[PDB]
Design a protein around this ligand. Sequence first.
Ligand SMILES: OC1CN(C(c2ccccc2)c2ccccc2)C1
Ligand SMILES: OC1CN(C(c2ccccc2)c2ccccc2)C1
Lengths: 267, 268
Amino acid sequence: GSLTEDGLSYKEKFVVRSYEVGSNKTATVETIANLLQEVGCNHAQSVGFSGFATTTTMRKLHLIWVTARMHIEIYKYPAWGDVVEIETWCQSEGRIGTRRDWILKDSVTGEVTGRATSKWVMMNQDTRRLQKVSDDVRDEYLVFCPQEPRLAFPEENNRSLKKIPKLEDPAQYSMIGLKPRRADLDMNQHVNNVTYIGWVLESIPQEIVDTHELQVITLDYRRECQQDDVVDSLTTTTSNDSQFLHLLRLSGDGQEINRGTTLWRKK
Amino acid sequence: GSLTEDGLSYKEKFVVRSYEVGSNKTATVETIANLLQEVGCNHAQSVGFSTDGFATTTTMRKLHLIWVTARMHIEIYKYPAWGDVVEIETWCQSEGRIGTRRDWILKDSVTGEVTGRATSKWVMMNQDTRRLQKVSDDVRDEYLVFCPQEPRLAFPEENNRSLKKIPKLEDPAQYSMIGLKPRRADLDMNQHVNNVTYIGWVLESIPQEIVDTHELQVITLDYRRECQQDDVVDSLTTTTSDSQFLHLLRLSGDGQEINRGTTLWRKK
Ligand SMILES: OC1CN(C(c2ccccc2)c2ccccc2)C1
Ligand SMILES: OC1CN(C(c2ccccc2)c2ccccc2)C1
């Protein structure tokens, strides 16, 4: 992997592994999400950042970046043995937070096979209190972002910015008692963001997965699942194409941890 | 990755990823086990097998036969750090009619030093009836040309840990993790639970304080029966001692054994 010529974006190639693919012999959306995370971490390391990606001022103030939303659109899932090239960049969104975008390409054809965007907010590591980005923090990372707008999702009222409603009981489908194991944790012992994507997908019936391809997934992150928490995954059909509304909540008290939507195309 | 000069082994380099490491910023034993599988699959593809979901010969496909893991044994001296490059070499050997063995050697790409080693036993099974069998001469002739003829063992030492008999854990277990269920990410391309998931489930019943203060040195795992996608598992562990543990995975309902194993840990 390497920063591009202008030093404002980062590119990396990956060979799709045998254990990374599903029944169709193509990468799962969770393998894609892991690759997006890996290339994001390699971009942060290349420009001088570090268990968390933080600036000097962020470390002094016990501040970290946390994902608020992840949005992924896949046109073609790379096959086992295929090489996928991923380009990533970040942009400041004023005082609200930051955005990281990605473009996925087939290395042989040069064709765009997917795109993704994510919203990140600043949080105090200890109190969990969200906050706006300060000028002092903003000055430390603006030199690594393009100054002119560069968007993976330029479209007028595109799906990546759509408000997601709260699923109403009773859900059409559910998967109950989901618990993270050690492999679900990151190096800081927090549940990996990609685990939540897997849990959302667990309540989609196997017949939809066997006859459809996942085209778009939008996921909001409201609260973290702790290592000793238990989750229930809920799904209701809202719709050639099938659309679903999703909700992850704690098994006991029903506290919301995530909400999302998925769009699927008939194979 | 590539076959070596003589065409009797295969080598591949891997850069350890951010999501592949634990609290110590080094690869987990499950990341290592996944890499061992990946290099094994790439070795099979390079010599003309697979491109269907299973590594099979022409005669195996005609007879609906597949290779299934009977035992996995891994010994790690140093876990590669995040960003480090690990080189893995693998090869296979026929063990007569019993089955086959695949071995691995792990090395730090910068120093050339051996950082780990692994060995696995594989048996032939009819994929529809699940009935185990010996390896026929016709099947053995199709894969013997891809194996070294003289013995080449990752674990040569007489009566080494990789060949030790593992006893069955007696109730009550000292520790347990109950109600473990596979999700879609735990499945392989044939919708079977990935062998590495069972390693993760075994490790789930080890208390977090042992993991925080010890490094896993050796793990031996026997595979007795597969966990189906709709099955639920209980992971049981008892200290037998360095720290040593005896492990047992069984179905949550009827208590049918799916795996048994042992782990050896060194105080950090
Ligand atoms: O997910 C978003 C991408 N942002 C980082 C980032 C920004 C520009 C280039 C590389 C990396 C970051 C900003 C400020 C402190 C530490 C890391 C956070
Ligand atoms: O996991 C064990 C090792 N595998 C062998 C094997 C694979 C398919 C058919 C016959 C034999 C082997 C693979 C690649 C080179 C040489 C032998 C099955």
